[PDB]
């Protein structure tokens, strides 16, 4: 299974970026496997705001967030084998921008 825990990010962070903001966990680990993240904020507009590390599941943010532009993101996180076949998930990853 995959455990995605909602992430809260204070609005208008100072840099340096990227900044780690949370971590998704696969119960079996990732040996021979890759985390993959998608959604608005990742691969749909606005693109490139959030990333996940394929091995560690560390979720990062790449810039300051304006809560009055977008207050919440609802992402998909899944795990594939090395060839891109889904083997776990997707599950919903909530990211909320807080005051
Ligand atoms: Zn699993
Ligand atoms: Zn890679």
UniProtKB/Swiss-Prot annotation:
Ranges for domain Cadherin: 5-99
Subcellular location field: Cell membrane; Cytoplasm
Tissues where this protein is expressed: Neural tissues. Also found in muscles; kidney and retina.
UniProt superkingdom: Eukaryota
Function: Cadherins are calcium-dependent cell adhesion proteins. They preferentially interact with themselves in a homophilic manner in connecting cells; cadherins may thus contribute to the sorting of heterogeneous cell types. May act as a negative regulator of neural cell growth.
Assembly and binders: By contrast to classical cadherins, homodimerization in trans is not mediated by cadherin EC1 domain strand-swapping, but instead through a homophilic adhesive interface which joins two elongated EC1-EC2 domains through a region near their Ca2+-binding sites to form a tetrahedral, X-like shape.
Entry comment, domain topic: Three calcium ions are usually bound at the interface of each cadherin domain and rigidify the connections, imparting a strong curvature to the full-length ectodomain.
Protein name: Cadherin-13
Species the sequence originates in: Gallus gallus (Chicken)
Phylogenetic placement of the source organism: Eukaryota, Metazoa, Chordata, Craniata, Vertebrata
Portion held of the full protein: 140 to 237 of 712
């Amino acid at each position: 299974s995959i455990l995605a825990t909602p992430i809260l990010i204070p609005e208008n962070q100072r840099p340096p970026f990227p900044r780690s903001v949370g971590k998704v966990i696969r119960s079996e680990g990732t040996e021979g496997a890759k985390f993959r993240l998608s959604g608005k904020g990742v691969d749909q507009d606005p693109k490139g705001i959030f990333r996940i590390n394929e091995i560690s599941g560390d979720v990062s943010v790449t810039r300051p967030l304006d809560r009055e532009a977008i207050a919440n993101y609802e992402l998909e996180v899944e795990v594939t084998d090395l060839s891109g076949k889904i083997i776990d998930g997707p599950v919903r990853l909530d990211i909320s921008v807080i005051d």
